[PDB]
């Protein structure tokens, strides 16, 4: 099966551009879009940083002219990407292995340009696609529609929407000094092209972490949560019906009942939610995943102080008080009316709203992406 890929630009004036990448069903091997309705499948190239060697980009018709519509194959790892004015650079290395624009690194060809992507799967079960600021907001923010069985609309960042998020964070860096501001990425006009998160600024100092941005930026704070929880219990509500684990702190250990254990963590960690006692490990069990993902999000939104049972009994607005905390996070939520904003985000007390960006559908017939507004 297949169905209708619709892309749309609202109201951007002049040119903008798709690119539709992804792994085609069973064969792993890359795969890219064509304008006129095709797929590019490239074969290995010659050495390392090759160009890619077709046009794939997909021109979109002016600022309210209607959709380009195409027909989209099953494919997973995919992504919609958008770019104003220009074309994005796309290169080849020995594999085939597609070499993806690197929004966090500065020295890559398309860092200065004004582009975006949302990423999406599409097997014979459903299509899944997922508006996320786990890593980074643009200036060109995309909504989705899916139709198929249901109508699903997942609604974009609003214009204007990264400039507030630039302008509050050099504000937060402001006061505490800490590196927020760098996580803004402004072009040669001024203009503001994106915000990272403190991770995908953290990664390049993993080799040498004495020299970490916001290494220190929890350390008290965790250290605080450590020695409470040496005296009196931490419960974890695991949810879906399956209960409560009550946890306590011996030396540097948090042991829940059943023999978890999660070693006390560093605000790479937090950021990362992938490391320290929060690294993922399929050696774990259920439980101990459910856990972990309920603790990181805690750590993230600073309630492992104020809420000795979690998640239940907390709400949104118990969260991100306080002068350290996940600031990133808690300025994105600000700043969008829907779409996680760290790793674990999808953790959220019974009773309250999915605020996921994600839209699926078991039987899609049109997926419309689009940007402007
Ligand atoms: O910016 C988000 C991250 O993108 C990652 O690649 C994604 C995953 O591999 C997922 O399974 O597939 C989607 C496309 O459907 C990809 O976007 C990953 O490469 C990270 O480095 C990157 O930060
Ligand atoms: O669309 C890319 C995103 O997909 C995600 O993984 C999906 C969900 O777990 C869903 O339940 O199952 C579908 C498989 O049909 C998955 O695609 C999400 O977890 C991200 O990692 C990914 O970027």
Not at 113 to 122: Q, Y
Not at 227 to 253: F, H, P, W
Not at 341 to 367: K, Q, T
Request: charged content about 20%.
């Amino acid at each position: 099966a297949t169905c209708e890929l619709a892309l749309e630009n609202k109201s951007l004036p002049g040119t903008v551009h798709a690119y539709v990448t992804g792994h085609e069903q069973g064969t792993d091997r890359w795969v890219l879009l064509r304008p006129d309705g095709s797929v590019y499948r490239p074969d290995s190239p010659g050495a390392p940083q090759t160009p890619l060697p077709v046009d794939c980009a997909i021109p979109l018709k002016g600022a309210g002219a209607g959709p380009v519509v195409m027909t989209l194959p099953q494919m997973y790892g995919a992504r919609v990407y958008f770019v104003r004015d220009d074309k994005l650079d796309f290169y080849l290395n020995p594999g085939p292995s597609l070499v993806e624009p690197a929004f966090a690194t500065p020295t890559d060809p398309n860092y200065g340009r004004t582009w975006s992507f949302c990423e999406f799967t599409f097997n014979p079960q459903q299509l899944y696609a997922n508006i996320s600021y786990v890593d980074l907001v643009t200036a060109l923010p995309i909504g989705l529609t899916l139709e198929g069985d249901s109508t699903h609309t997942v609604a974009p960042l609003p214009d204007g929407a990264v400039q507030r998020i630039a302008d509050d964070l050099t504000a937060q860096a402001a006061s505490d000094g800490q590196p927020w501001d760098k996580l803004v990425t402004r072009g040669s006009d001024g203009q503001v092209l994106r915000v990272v998160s403190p991770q995908n600024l953290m990664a390049p100092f993993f080799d040498r972490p004495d020299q970490m941005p916001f290494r220190d930026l929890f350390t008290a704070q965790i250290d605080e949560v450590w020695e409470k929880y040496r005296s009196t219990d931490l419960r974890i509500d695991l949810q879906g019906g399956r209960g409560t684990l009550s946890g306590r702190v011996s030396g540097d250990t948090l042991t829940f009942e059943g023999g978890h254990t999660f070693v006390k963590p560093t605000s790479k960690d937090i950021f990362t939610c992938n490391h320290g006692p929060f690294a993922n490990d399929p050696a774990d069990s259920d439980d101990k995943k459910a856990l972990l993902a309920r603790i990181a999000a805690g750590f993230n939104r600073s309630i492992m102080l104020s809420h000795p049972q979690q998640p239940n009994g907390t709400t949104v607005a118990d969260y991100y008080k306080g002068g350290v905390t996940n600031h990133w996070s808690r300025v994105v939520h600000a700043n969008s009316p829907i779409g996680y904003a760290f790793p674990y985000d999808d953790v959220r007390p019974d009773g309250e709203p999915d605020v996921s960006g994600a839209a699926h559908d078991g039987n899609p017939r049109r997926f419309t992406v689009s940007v402007g507004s």
